[PDB]
Structures are given as structure tokens and as C-alpha cells.
Design an enzyme around this catalytic site. Structure first.
Site, PDB file in Angstrom:
ATOM      1  N   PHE A   1       0.827  -1.200   0.000  1.00  0.00           N
ATOM      2  CA  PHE A   1       0.000   0.000   0.000  1.00  0.00           C
ATOM      3  C   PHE A   1       0.861   1.250   0.000  1.00  0.00           C
ATOM      4  O   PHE A   1       0.478   2.277  -0.574  1.00  0.00           O
ATOM      5  CB  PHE A   1      -0.931  -0.015   1.207  1.00  0.00           C
ATOM      6  N   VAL A   2       2.033   1.177   0.630  1.00  0.00           N
ATOM      7  CA  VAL A   2       2.987   2.270   0.563  1.00  0.00           C
ATOM      8  C   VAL A   2       3.601   2.326  -0.830  1.00  0.00           C
ATOM      9  O   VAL A   2       3.690   1.316  -1.540  1.00  0.00           O
ATOM     10  CB  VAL A   2       4.065   2.114   1.650  1.00  0.00           C
ATOM     11  N   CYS A   3       3.994   3.524  -1.237  1.00  0.00           N
ATOM     12  CA  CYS A   3       4.619   3.691  -2.537  1.00  0.00           C
ATOM     13  C   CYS A   3       6.030   3.113  -2.504  1.00  0.00           C
ATOM     14  O   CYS A   3       6.766   3.333  -1.536  1.00  0.00           O
ATOM     15  CB  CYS A   3       4.662   5.165  -2.928  1.00  0.00           C
ATOM     16  N   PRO A   4       6.430   2.365  -3.529  1.00  0.00           N
ATOM     17  CA  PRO A   4       7.763   1.754  -3.524  1.00  0.00           C
ATOM     18  C   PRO A   4       8.871   2.772  -3.740  1.00  0.00           C
ATOM     19  O   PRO A   4       9.453   2.847  -4.822  1.00  0.00           O
ATOM     20  CB  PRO A   4       7.680   0.752  -4.678  1.00  0.00           C
ATOM     21  N   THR A   5       9.178   3.552  -2.703  1.00  0.00           N
ATOM     22  CA  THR A   5      10.071   4.692  -2.877  1.00  0.00           C
ATOM     23  C   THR A   5      11.521   4.254  -3.028  1.00  0.00           C
ATOM     24  O   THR A   5      12.237   4.771  -3.891  1.00  0.00           O
ATOM     25  CB  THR A   5       9.906   5.653  -1.702  1.00  0.00           C
TER      26      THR A   5
END
Lengths: 165, 165, 165, 165, 165, 165, 165, 165, 165, 165
Positions: free
Chosen positions: A45-49
Site C-alpha cells: 500500500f505504501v509507494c515503492p520509494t
């Protein structure tokens, strides 16, 4: 598992390079430093930074004679799936490093980053010398992502120290 | 592992029901037959014929007092990812059964369908009695998919025989 | 015992083919798929529906390059006795498959269908590849009998997938 | 296994008395000598001379306060099958002793007469004292059958010696 | 110890044949059936009925190509003592079989008839095939003596069955 | 040793704080993040750049509710000796963190940074959560020193993620 | 086995006192020195010189508060047999000491005089203190017999030293 | 330890012969009977009656082709000290046998006469055959000394029996 | 064995104080430093220089609140023998310290000075604190004897350091 | 560990001779006695009296064909640091013996002087024969320092005794 001053354990599996499955061994990158870069799981759900931040900065690793092998404990079809997911939809988009599939979780177990209860990898970064031995072991717990200037500083440094001292 | 005439091993994990993660235990379906349905991995190049063929025929399992729990050794984010992938793009689309994530591969190991070398599950179908014991064990090697009329015939049959004899 | 993706265990014993004892090894059917078909015991009060349903449909297994070896944990004299029992008296009558006698219960133990407490076999159906490896494992608990169109569908399917993919 | 001067091992299973299955324990015959009479298997090509010779002479065992329990390692359906086979067709016909089914081969293993390689019993005759201890152990290899006047002589003798000395 | 269908254990020791010590091995009677006949101890208060009944009937064992080796766990001086005791004084008198001395109780232990607590042998009769394997095992507890027509019937029978079947 | 997602091992020993020996336990800093900072040995020919770079930046660790515990496998008299060595003579000079003496090498063994063959510690940095569990594990081989902005970034990050997520 | 300065092992068995079987324990002679006198076997070709020489000199052992228990590994019926054999026929005749039967060879094993290969006892003489501990251990190999004045000298001596010192 | 009918254990050490240390092995007396004669310790308050009684009677052992090796667990300097102590001062005086020093207590342990709690030897006398095997084992507890006519009688006797029988 | 900084092992045995046997435990000298002084054996050809040099200087050990316990692995009768040997004859003469007899060699084994192959003690000197712990361990190989001013210097020193520091 | 009469364990490591690191093995001093001289740790608050007292008296060890190897469990940089510390500042100053660094604590463990709980060495002095075997073992607990005239007396003495006796 993977002691620093000892030899790095071998990794081998189906990666995703340039949009397809390549079945990559560690021995494909002999003569290079390896930056073995465990991210925990796909499609989060977090952006793959951090993995986009390594894939965009891949030239800085091609210049220091090293290869960043992003590993997850997910299967190579999920890796190929979210490399092919567009980046505005939470996906990767352009991915310029081997997205290695440790579906049997043998690479993450050998590098001590496997969370055995949940079957995923710790956020890990391992710098293997081109003699094959490990030299650096940055392991984060699942919140805090890795940084690319940190890996480049340590990487180089290992480069300058293996040159001179 | 999972002997037939003995008690079925417990399964528990984050499934995907109706487009979200539900963290489902086996004990949620006490008083029902369980049809524990291992498919090997997500996002495969082949079309997911058997799991769509179970999800479309879910009423035939609601009528026989049973619950089909489709399991894979993939993480629940990949399950949620290819349930949310449209069906014309090789994805599932509408999915009307618990897509259980055995990311630690503890359920697939306990049901003897884990391919330990590759970290995926055999194509397996297990019919657990509502006393909790296993009764039926259809395990296919990775090519041949399961059929739904076969599972319904055996399922029922177990229903009629547990009623009468 | 008998894992699917591994090699099938060898079976060898005195069968009943065409009304006499033949002392048949697994190696007699090299180059064929094997459909190893455990029924629980002889002379049962229930009518032998599934073994007559396989013996009458033996042409459908001769066409798919396979041999159905019906196994029980009973001795070969009981097998020869109820093959020679007329079918209206609860017996088999015409029997067109090897009725293999696993009297030492070594075949049923190696195929995981032996009920060790009662000395009989689970209702089992195992499809061995003609490379000798197992591919399919349908195990029923003692009430529910096997079906022949199910075995033919899975059998073939293994045939088409071993041909192409 | 079954030492003579020690206690006889317990036997318990589904026998055939008077044409039906009775599920008989050793404790049903407490206060009697037991003549535990292993014959090898059912439906044999040889005529069942010794078991018919014990069943016809059952009054001579009812007079000496003993019970002849004919055991085989065959299942109780085969026992009921060849008790119900007419005697001119190689069968038993009238059978007046418990035809005990040791299908799990636990009784024949505990009495040391199990031929483990072939799953049948040695031709055995064991005289258990009504204290429950064994006293006599006649074990033949598979050709030579037991005699009834021998068993009656030894039986009695144990009777007279347990009375006086 | 001494399983029937397996090979008989070797016996070797100082016997008493025709009034003197002969130091007899089992291999002296190769090519013969052996009737190894354990009686419990020497000089007993009871009259030695069964060993005199075998020694008087020794011609019936010479005719069936067998040798009756009467064993006890007593020393060969006691055997020579009560063979030389006149028969009206409770002794043997004429003794026409090898009275073998198992003073170390190695033969009685190997034939499972040794009563280890009291150091004597069970009343045992063992018929060894002339291939060296055991075939028959009649073991009585200490009261009931063996009969000679029983041993001759079983002996022969083994003879006729080893000839034909 | 010291797994990340598990509990950090306890450290306890004689440190050097503000120019004297203080005998400091881990429990002195309960309620704080711990930055356990292994440097290899004292009085080295290289200038102690990283430990002076942590001691000068100690305010940035006092602001993030953490304590940097610099560990070496040297005895506390050597630690007190080269803290008291002036910085222009290759020494530390002002040292504003606990210089912990792991002379028994129990802390460096429990944190997996002990080089057992040479008795010194790997260049290690470990961020223990104030619940006592480890969260971060930066281990360098002996050339490459740690950086303070890296530790502050990861430290904080653990702070923000333990606050929110 | 039977160390001297330790406690003597218990002996218990059927002896022959005054022409009959008495079933004698060691505890029958509590408060006496014991002279446990192993002779090898009964009915030997040599004349029983030493046991007749102890039985005739039994008054010299009744005067020194001791009991000579002649042991052999033979059964009590052989002991009763050659006590009842007249002395001119190579037998004992009058026998005035307990002729103990160690037929299970438990007493001769506990006193270290058992020749395990031949099942007989070494020519042994053991003087047990009336506290129950052993004090003297004369063991001869099978040729050389014991002497009675030697046993009386040592016996007494133990008597005088247990009185005074 | 030192069984009678088995081989005697080897002894080797610094003895005292004729007033000096000789470092004597058992193999020095090959072809002789050995009379290995343990006395407990040197310089005792009691007069050394038995060792003077053997040394004065040494001609009776030279005539029977044997050597009396008096052993103690004391060191050879104490042996040389109390051989050189005059006999009226409680000492030995003239000593005409090897006074062997078992200071490591290896000879007394191998001959079972070592009192391990107090480090001394039991009063022991062992007659080794000139084949090297033990034949006689007279072990006394510490009060009662050995006699020389007893040793000469047994010694000879072994001599006459090894000559004839 | 006897580590320095650990607790000294207990010693207990028959010593020689003032010309007689006293049966002395370590606990007799509680509240004193112990100087446990192993010399190798009695009656040696060399003059006993070091033990006479400790016995003559016993006042210097009575002044420092310590007791010199001279130990040897010899028996107490040899100790009493060469204390009573006049000093011009190579003996001790006046002996003013406990000459402890470690005949079982348990004290010399616990203090690590036992030469197990020869059964004697190394030339050892052990200074036990009056808390019972060892503090000093001077062990010489058999040539070089101990000095008394060395023991007094170390002894004291331990005294001054246990007083102050 | 390091028994006296056995062979001394090997030592090897980076020492400090004449102000620099030399990486010295034990085999560098073959043909010499070794005086292996453990002092506990560097930079102590007490003045280093005993090691300066050995370094100033190094000529007395060069004359007796021996080498004093001062060992500590500290690293060679601390050794080089406090050899280079001026003697009026609590340091060594001129140091004329190998200051051996046992940083892995392998030499102090092999010589039994390692205090494992605190990682330092006991105050130890070990005199190794030039055959390589140990001969002398002076171990002090941490207060009391070694003396140089004691080491010279024992050293020599070993020299004179290895010359003559």
C-alpha cells in the site's frame, strides 16, 4: 547465516530484468560488487520509494562496478506483474535492476533477513565484495527504507579501500 | 502432514474476501465442510481457469454447507492485486471465495502440497469434514487443474454418507 | 510415503488377471501411465460399483496408454474368489483389470492409503507418469467411491500436458 | 512376542460366529482355556481340512472348558464369504468356532506366527490358560496342518495338571 | 530366538550316546531332519516318561531320516549319571538318543525354551528341516509332556510335504 | 546472536563517561532508543574519525531520545587512556558518549560483530527500540567507517514510524 | 561382581540339607560367617575330595560360628541325586552342609566364579563376615581343589581379628 | 580386572631386589609361575609377618619354578627404606623377593585388590600360570595375612595338574 | 582442578604432626591462609632440603596467620617413618608442619600436581585465602625445589593486599 | 590447559619489541627457555612495577639463555601506546621484552591464566624448557605481582638441573 567478514551465501533464481524472467545466478555478476537489496513484499500500500530510488540511480551503481539485485520473497510473476504495473497506480513502472524472486525464501534465509513467521524479508542491503565475501550488512526493520546515497557512500568507500587500504 | 482419516491441520492467515484483507482462521468456518483449494502461484501466464471456475460456482458450495478456501503461497497483496486485475488482462476479476495467503508456506506444508524447492503449492483440493477431520485429498501436479463437478460430486457424497452411511 | 511430484513407490505382487494369479510387478507396465486404484476390502456388503465401473470402462484406459491396477490389502485367493463370484451374488463377475493383492500391506503403506489400525486401504486413485513419477493423488475416505470420468479427465489431461505443456 | 510361561497377548477383533460378525474380545472367554488356532489365509486351493476338523470336533472343546478361536490375517468379509461358501466348492460350510479376522495382523504379530513378508499367519495353535497365560505353542510352517487329537490331548493334559499337578 | 520359517540356531555340546560323552555338533546330522527335544532337568521325582518313550521309539525316527536330540540344561555328568541309573530307580536305563548337555544354557536360550529365572528348559520339541531351517515348534510348559506319535505325524508330514508339496 | 525483529541482547560493563569509569548497564537507558556503536580497537594508527564524529554530534542524538553507546572489545583503562589522549596526538580528546569496554567480548559476541579470530569488533551500528528490541543493524567490515547523518536519518525514521506507522 | 571389602551379594536357592530340598536364603544364616564354597559340577569322574573333606569337617565350622554353603551351578535334583549316591560309587554319601543349587547361575555370576562359556563355577571359597560383607576370596581354576585347614585358618583369623583387631 | 580362567594382567615397575631398584617387568619371569603377593602398605605398626615369612621361604618357591613378587602401592623409595630398616625396629631386614612398587596403583587396580578409597592393596595372592594366565586368586581383607604353606600347596598342585591333569 | 581465582579444593587425610597421625581436614585451619606444599615422594636419594627449610622456618608462617601443609602421595606410615628417620641418615628429623598423606592421590589430583603416570605429586605450592579460595599456584617440575623466602613474600603480600588492596 | 610436566601450548601474536609491532611466534625463541609473563591489563592505575622490573633486568635473562615474553590480553595498539607513554605518566617508557598481545585471549586461555568473566589474564609466570615443555607455573591472583629474583632463581635452577640433574 551471512556473516560480514566471511563469504556471502550464493543467490540464484528467476529475476525480472527489462520486463522478462532471466533465471539469474550470483555468478553472472562475478568481478562486481553486489548490492543485494531486500525489500519486504510486492504490491504494498505504501509507494515503492526505495526500489524506484535505486532503479532511477542505477547509473551510479554501473559506474562503481556493482550490481544492485533487488530481492523479495515473492514469486517472479508478481515481480513481473508490478514492474508492469504503471507507476501512477502504485507500481514500479521502469525498473532497471534485477528484481530477484526468492519464492522459496532460501536467499532471504541465507542473508538473515527472512522474517520466518510472515515469510517476508527484512529491509536489507548487503554489499558483497567481488571476491565473493560480504563486507557490509545494513538491515532495517520493515518501516524504515534504505537510502541510495548511503549505499553509494559505503559502496565506493569499499571500492577505495579495496584499491588502496 | 495431512493424512485423510486423521484430523486436518489448522489453517490461518490473511485472505482476500470481496476485495479486502480479512485475516481468516479455519475456525471461522466451523460447522461447514471445507474445500481447501491450493493453486500454485499468482499472475501466471496461463489463464486462471480453475479458480474462476470455483468462484463462479460458489453457490453450489454454499448449498452443500461448505466453504472453498483457495490457497496460494503468495502474499495477500499479490492476491488483492490480481483479484483487482480485470479478467480480460489475465486476472481474476470477480472473486467470490477466500483467497488465502500462505506466504510463510505453513498451510501448504501442513497439507503436503508445498513444493519446497520452488516455494509454491501443488494443485490440491482437500475436503475437510465439519468435525475437522480430512476426508478427501485430490493432489495434482502443476499442469492439470481441478474440476468443479468432481469436487461437487465428492463433496456431496461425503454429505450423503455423513448423513446416512 | 508417495509424494506427488516425486517418484511413485514400486508395487509388486500376485494380481488376478482374467481369472488367474499372475505375480505382477510395476515394471510390467513401463511406458504406460499407471492408475493405481485402491479399494478397501473384498466381499463387502455394498455392491462393488466403482471397480466394476472401472473394469467395464477398461477400453477407455487402454486408449489413453494406461493401466488400471486395482489394489486391495486382501490376499490373492480372496481376489480370485470374488472375481469368480457371480455379479448377481454381490460379486465382481467379469473383471478386466489387474486385481492386485497387497496382503503384506506394503503397497498401501507406500501409497499412504493404508488404514493401519484396520489393515485396509483408503479409497485411493494414483496416476503415475510413464516416467515412473506420481502426478495425481485422489484419496477418499472409505464411504465415497471413485468415479471413472474423473479419472479419465485427469488421466488424459496429464496425457495432453505431457505431450505439449 | 508370545512366550509360553508368560502372559498371552490379548486378541480382539471381528470374528464370524454362526454366520455373522460379532466383534469378539479375548475377555469374552475369561474362565476358559483358549485354543488360538492360526490358519494362513482364506479361499486356498487346498481343502480346508484342519479348520473343518476343528469345527466338527467343537463338542470335544466345549467339554474341556475351552474355546477354539480360528484366526487368519484376512478380513472378516472374506471369513464370512468362505464360511458361506458351500463345502463341496472348496469352502467351509458349517463353521462352529469364532473365525477371527486379524486384518491389521496385530494378533498374528503378537503370537509370533505372522509371516511379515507375505502378510499371512503360520499354522499355529496356542493354548492359553484360563489365568490368561500361555501354556502351549504349536507352530507349524505353512504345509503341515494341525491335528485335533493332538490339541485335545495337550489341552486336557493341561486341564488335569492344572487340577492336580 | 528360533523363528519357525527362519534358520534354526546351531547347537553344539557334549551329549551322551550309548553311555559315554561324544561332544556332538548339529553338523554331525546334516542331511537329516532334527527333532530337538528339550526336557527340563535330570533326576526328577516324576518318572521320565517322554524321553524313555522317545528312546524306545528311536527306530521310528531312524526310518524317517531324522535324529532326536534330547536336550537339557544339565551338565553331561548328570546326563551320564541318570542314563546309568537303572530304570526301576527312577532313571533312564537304556537311552538310544543323544542326551545333549546345554550346561551353559546357550541352546535352550537360542531355542526360546530357556526359563531364565530357574535355569531349565521348557518342554520343547523342534523339527529342523535338513536344509537347516526350523519348521515346527512344539513348546509345552513344564507339566505336560510331549507325545511320540504327534512328533512322528508332524515329522513325516514335513517329509511328505518336502518331497511333494 | 542479535536478530533485528527480535529482542536486542543486554549489554553491561564499565564505560567511560566524561573522563571516568561508570559501570553502565543497558537498563540505565530504558525509555530511549539505543545506538550501539562498535568500533574495532583503541589507539589505532588511523585517526578516530567516526567516534569523534559521533561525540561531536551528540546533541543530535540527545534530541532524538537516544543514546549512542560506543563499544570496543578493549579494556576500560585503554578507553580512559585514549579519551585522555589529546586529539592532536591521534587520540579522542573530548568524548561525549559512553565508551563501553567489552573486554570479555560478550557484548560484541551477542551483537554478532565480534571477529573471534582477532578479538575485535566489526564496525557496527545497532539501533535498539526503547521497547528493547533491535530494529536496525548496520555492520561494516573493518575499513569503512559509519556515518552520522545515516544513523540520524534511520534513527529518526524509526522515531516517526514508531510514532505513526 | 563380589568385591572383598564391599558387601557380599545375596544368594538364595534350593539347597540339599540332610537329604532333601530346603529352599535356603542367605538370610537364614544371619549372625554367622558364611563360607560360600563353589565346586564346579556334579557327578564328576574325579572323586569329590574337597566337598567330602568339608562335610566331614563340618564340626570345625560349627565351632567357629560359620556355615559352609557348597554351591554348584547344577540343579537341586542332581545335588539330591549324588548326595544319595553311595560314596564307593563316586558319590557323596553323607553330606552335612547345604548343597546349594545355582541352576540359573545367578549366585556364581554374582561371586565372579561363573565360567560363562561352560556354565559351571570356578573352584571358589568366599568368607562373608556376619555383617554381610565379604572378607576373603579364594578362587581356584578348575584343577586345584580347596583345602579345609586353609579355610579354617583364614576363617578363625577373621574371627580373632573381628573380635580384637 | 583379573579373572582367574583368563589371562593375568601385566605388571611392570620399579621393584627392590637385594637392596636396590631394578625396574622389573612381568616378562622377566616368563616360563615361571608367578605368585603376585599384595601386602597393603609399608612401615605398618604390625610386624610384617607374612612378607618375612615369604622371603625366608623363598627357596620353596625357587624349587617350584615360581617367583613371588611382593607388591604394595607404595613408592620404591619406601620399599628400599623398610627393606633397609633392621628387623628388630619393625622392618624387613633381609628381603629375598621382588618388592614391587605400584605407586601409580595400576597393578593393584588390574588385580582387583586396590582399595580405591584409601589407595592401598588388599592382602592378595595370585598364582599366574607360566602360560601367563591366572589360575588362583586368594584375596584377603586387610586383617588376615596370607600363609606360605597354603601358597606352596596350591602352587605345587597347579604344578602337578599342569604336568598331568 | 584447582583454578586460582576460584575456590580451593578441600583436602582431608591422615597427617603427621609432632610424631603421630592426626587425621587432619582443611577445616581445621579455617581462618588461616593455607600453604599447601606438595613434595613428590618420601625417602628420596636427594636430601629433603625444601621441607626441612619450611619446617625450620615454621615460625615465619605462624606469624603470618598461615599453615604450611606439606603433602605427598605417600602413605602416613612412610611419613611417620621418615619424620622419625634421623636427619643425618637422609631423613627429616624434627618436622614442625603437617606432613599430609595423600595416599589415594585425591588431594594431588584436585590440585593439578599429580603426575598420574608415576603416582607422585609435582613440586607444588598453593596459597589458599582464609576465605577458602586459592590465590597463588607455584608448580615446579620435579627437579627444582621451592624456596621459603619466595613463599613468605607472596604470602605476606597476599596478607597486605587482603588487608588494604 | 598448560600442565607443567607436559608440553607448553604454542603462543603466537603481534608483540611490541623496541617500539614496533613484530608478529612473534613461540618458534622464534627455539633453543631458549621461555619466561611467559602474564600481566593483567594495560594502562592500570597502579604503577607497572613488575614489568618494568623485568624489562630493566632483561640482561639477567639474556645471560640465562631465556626470553621473557610479557603477555596481556590487550591489543597491540594499547601495548604500543603505553610502551610509548612516558614512565612518569604511569607508563612503561623503555620496554626491553616482547609485549605480546593476546587480544583473542587464546594464549591466556591455553595457559590457564585467563579470567574468562573479565577477559584479562591472571598474574602468571611460566618457564618453558627449550625442549618446548613447561617446567614451572607461578600463577598469582590479580593483587600480588611477580618478583624477578624469584624467576631468576627458578630459571637458573632449571638450567643447572637440565645440565646435570
Amino acid at each position: 547465516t551471512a556473516t560480514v567478514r566471511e563469504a556471502a551465501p550464493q543467490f540464484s533464481g528467476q529475476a525480472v530484468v527489462n520486463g522478462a524472467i532471466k533465471d539469474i545466478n550470483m555468478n553472472d555478476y562475478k568481478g562486481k560488487y553486489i548490492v543485494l537489496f531486500f525489500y519486504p513484499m510486492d504490491f504494498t500500500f505504501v509507494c515503492p520509494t526505495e526500489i524506484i530510488a535505486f532503479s532511477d540511480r542505477h547509473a551510479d551503481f554501473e559506474k562503481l562496478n556493482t550490481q544492485v539485485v533487488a530481492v523479495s520473497c515473492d514469486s517472479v510473476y508478481s515481480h513481473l506483474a508490478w514492474v508492469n504495473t504503471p507507476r501512477k497506480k502504485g507500481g514500479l513502472g521502469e525498473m532497471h535492476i534485477p528484481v530477484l524472486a526468492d519464492k522459496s525464501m532460501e536467499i532471504a534465509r541465507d542473508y538473515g533477513v527472512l522474517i520466518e513467521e510472515s515469510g517476508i524479508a527484512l529491509r536489507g542491503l548487503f554489499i558483497i565484495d567481488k571476491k565473493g565475501i560480504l563486507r557490509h550488512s545494513t538491515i532495517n526493520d520493515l518501516p524504515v527504507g534504505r537510502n541510495v546515497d548511503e549505499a553509494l557512500r559505503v559502496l565506493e568507500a569499499f571500492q577505495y579501500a579495496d584499491e588502496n587500504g
